[PDB]
Design a protein around this ligand. Structure first.
Ligand SMILES: O=P(O)(O)O[C@H]1[C@H](OP(=O)(O)O)[C@@H](OP(=O)(O)O)[C@H](OP(=O)(O)O)[C@@H](OP(=O)(O)O)[C@H]1OP(=O)(O)O
Lengths: 205, 205, 205, 205, 205, 205
């Protein structure tokens, strides 16, 4: 990543073993559960494109997903090249192409050069946006169940139903009342409109 | 977070993998037991609003609770906008709205700018107060038992009863004597008024 | 905590996740065994009153004990207010009350201000003394057995008896000879007076 | 490794126990799965040739592979000597041979001298390229199955088939449609040409 | 401990949670096996007397041993007072007594003052010597078996016998040949005198 | 160890708990497998002789081996004294003897003095060479099997045979073809001379 030192210049630092290990584990344990994406974003804070490629490449399974991500990345790179065409002056900074931003045709030195320039071309933040676009599509695709099939069981506590319901909504990116069981539905209808979630859960406890 | 370096300027530092992992674990193990809230507060020391969103977003279950928290946050943001209306001068710091404080409409750079300004607008501390308000409501809601149903069993050591009693009081945010068993109640009545907890526990040992 | 940096000023540092986790574990594993108190003292080195409250508040069980501790803290605060009454000059340091020292009516900024003042008012060290007073009472109260009931078994090695004996003495805060079994007692009587513990253990091996 | 300090000079730092342990583990757990190579590259960031030899030498099994790697390294060193022949001036930097780059005939001091020279001779990056060439051959050799033998089972979800298919392609360094089962193949034929992987997976869900 | 910072002054640093935990574990796992003493010495590098008391006090079992250690410490303190009697000048450093060195009658500030003085009075190194004297006696006392009872079994490999033999010698602080079994003894007699241990082990393989 | 700080002077640093623990574990798990020696070398980077003694002394078993190592060290020290005889000028650096290099008759201060002198007498690197000489002899001695007894089984994959073969060669510090099974031997004979290991393994797959 690029960090500020103790004396206030922006410098390159090796990706840490703890960071590498945390990512691989979270993917092993959680696959593409929606909470994996904010974890990715936080572990890749200050990342160069090389660091972002390292994190993606260290994943060993889920190679269907990692291929779909490559496709999304290539579409975003091609749209970048559409908006930002490029033509080098000895010793001068060249302009990045899509593939430079994705770290396939750029060196670490060029990446540091762009990201620390005054003003900076934040190639790591741009690439991370493309990656997260790609990851969100994967989360949606690997969502097991439609929100239409989340209905409260006759013996299911209302709290457990609401947990399943919002978990599903998150992955898919008055239905709550419609899908409640007969007993809670009756209570909820009687609360009248514009009830908060806290009030609905309280009433159905 | 925003930290002081070794040479005494306030600077942004990446959230650490250890911090991220500690929070997710504590939520996995303890759900919304009341001791989870001081742990949240300590792990989020120096946090920007972006860091606070990261910590909340990395939680994978309990999505009913995380929705109720969003509701509380939106009420606090709306009250902020009531007390602090806003109208930008090239190169100058804009005034934060509620949604800026909650980190949904503000950038990390703006967040750092507010928090390090002379004098600072402590947007991370303000947002953390809203979050903790929301978390306290969740702790109360997920409290399993009323204090009225904590009564000492005929064979239950007085110490174990007092542990259950104050554990319940904490989550709900002379009853101790009333709810004691016949044998301890008699001892306790005879101690006369204004006995410390240490004396009551000693007497009932 | 308040630490010295690499360049020799006293500065505030966030409590670390490792410190938070170590305390909670030691309390989970050892409850109020006497060795928990030196561990508390070492983990809270440089602590502000806010840090000390964090460590106490992150404990989830033992709420009878944590209530008894609050009582001890309130007695020490009230004695502080007796010895050190207080009456603020714009921009000047106010004098701390008992509740300021215990961190319930003081801010982190005021706490840092006192502890780094020339000369310092060491509010973290004062509060830690009150806490340890309270913890020692809890250790004594949760001591399972009287020293009078620690007697060497007919088949119990003398070493194992002495371990039980001094473990009990520690928690309760010639008896060793009196409580020995017939065979060791005879050996020990014959050593004559003023024998070291090493000599007694050697003789009874 | 060679790192930048807090005050911006390039200096030698000991390889950390965490780095040493992470490599040995990943090799214990994953053998020569293709994802082991980006992990190697990331753990050896800033490495001197001595550090790279340390990491390879700390592997205890897989000695057939480690011998094959030595062979690849010796071929790359010999090609280096072909392109860059060498002839020492008291106190002056000598030119590195192949075996100097591989760290068998060079000292740590000479290695630091080359890598920190203005302009630097990046002997650690050159050696790492040779090592990765050698590792890629090993990954290909230890690939269990041909891509021709990855075919979708009659009851196998299309997602699981695509995961096996791209996992195999990665290790080997319209076939996807040809190797699909009758039911998915029919769906896929009907999508018409130039379908993305996302569309194929969606259609076959 | 007292450490050198990044800018070369000797300063006090909190004992780390990792250090505290490592000591307690090693004592839990290894009791007073002789290898515990070099581990103690290494974990207490730079220790103040307060740090050394912390490490000893955090041990929860083995209270017979910890009492025997107190006795040894009190004898060494009393011998110190014999060799170095003491008589304070406002603002000046007082001379340490035995109990000051053992950290029972001295403050952390006084301890730092002695250890960083020009020239320093190394109170932490002096106390550590007393502690190690005491620990060595405990290792000897808890040694299970005499070296006279370590004899090679008729089916016991010579290597395993030599491991038991030197393990016992270490704890107790031509016998090797005398205690060998008939078959190895014969081989060893025939090697003639002044054979190295390597030669004896080779011969008996 | 002796490290460079953030501001570029060579200074003494305490051996870390992580380093101490990593060594003890690796010896517990791997005994004197050949890969233990590069691990020792990497964990002892920058070590003083005191640090090297700490690492050796913290090993609890294998006391036959640790005695054989002492013997090797004493022979290397005696050869040092042969090549470098010594005769002290107030305040001046004395010349190290063998036993000074092995850290038995030298203090930590003298050790730091030698290693940081201009030009340095690298007593830690010299001692580490003696130790590694001694360790290599132990690895050879504890090698279970001769290379002559590594032969491919009738049903043993060629890869697994080559792994056993080079593992044994490493510990002992056309035979591969001679010891192959009939079926692979035939294939290998037919490849003709000067085949790489990769080609032999490919042919026998
Ligand atoms: O951030 P973490 O993955 O939780 O690991 C930390 C980290 O070590 P790594 O940089 O090797 O990962 C610390 O280094 P810093 O963050 O302070 O630079 C180190 O602390 P030290 O500075 O004291 O070496 C500490 O080790 P310690 O146990 O000594 O506190 C260790 O945590 P663990 O070794 O407990 O996993």
């Amino acid at each position: 990543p690029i960090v500020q030192n103790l004396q206030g210049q922006m410098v390159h630092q090796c990706i840490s073993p703890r960071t590498l290990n945390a990512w691989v584990k979270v993917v092993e344990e959680k696959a593409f559960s929606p909470e994996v994406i904010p974890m990715f974003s936080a572990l890749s804070c200050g990342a160069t494109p090389q660091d972002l490629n390292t994190m993606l490449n260290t994943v060993g399974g889920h190679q269907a997903a990692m291929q779909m991500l490559k496709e999304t990345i290539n579409e975003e790179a091609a749209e970048w090249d559409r908006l930002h065409p490029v033509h080098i002056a000895p010793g001068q900074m060249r302009e990045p192409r899509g593939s430079d931003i994705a770290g396939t045709t750029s060196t670490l030195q060029e990446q540091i050069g762009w990201m620390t320039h005054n003003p900076p071309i934040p190639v790591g933040e741009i690439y991370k946006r493309w990656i997260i676009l790609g990851l969100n599509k994967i989360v949606r695709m690997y969502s097991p169940t439609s929100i239409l099939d989340i209905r409260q069981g006759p013996k299911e506590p209302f709290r457990d139903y609401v947990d399943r319901f919002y978990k599903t909504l998150r992955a898919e990116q008055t239905l709550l009342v419609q899908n409640a069981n007969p007993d809670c539905k009756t209570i909820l209808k009687a609360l009248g409109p514009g009830a908060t979630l806290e009030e609905m859960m309280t009433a159905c406890q």
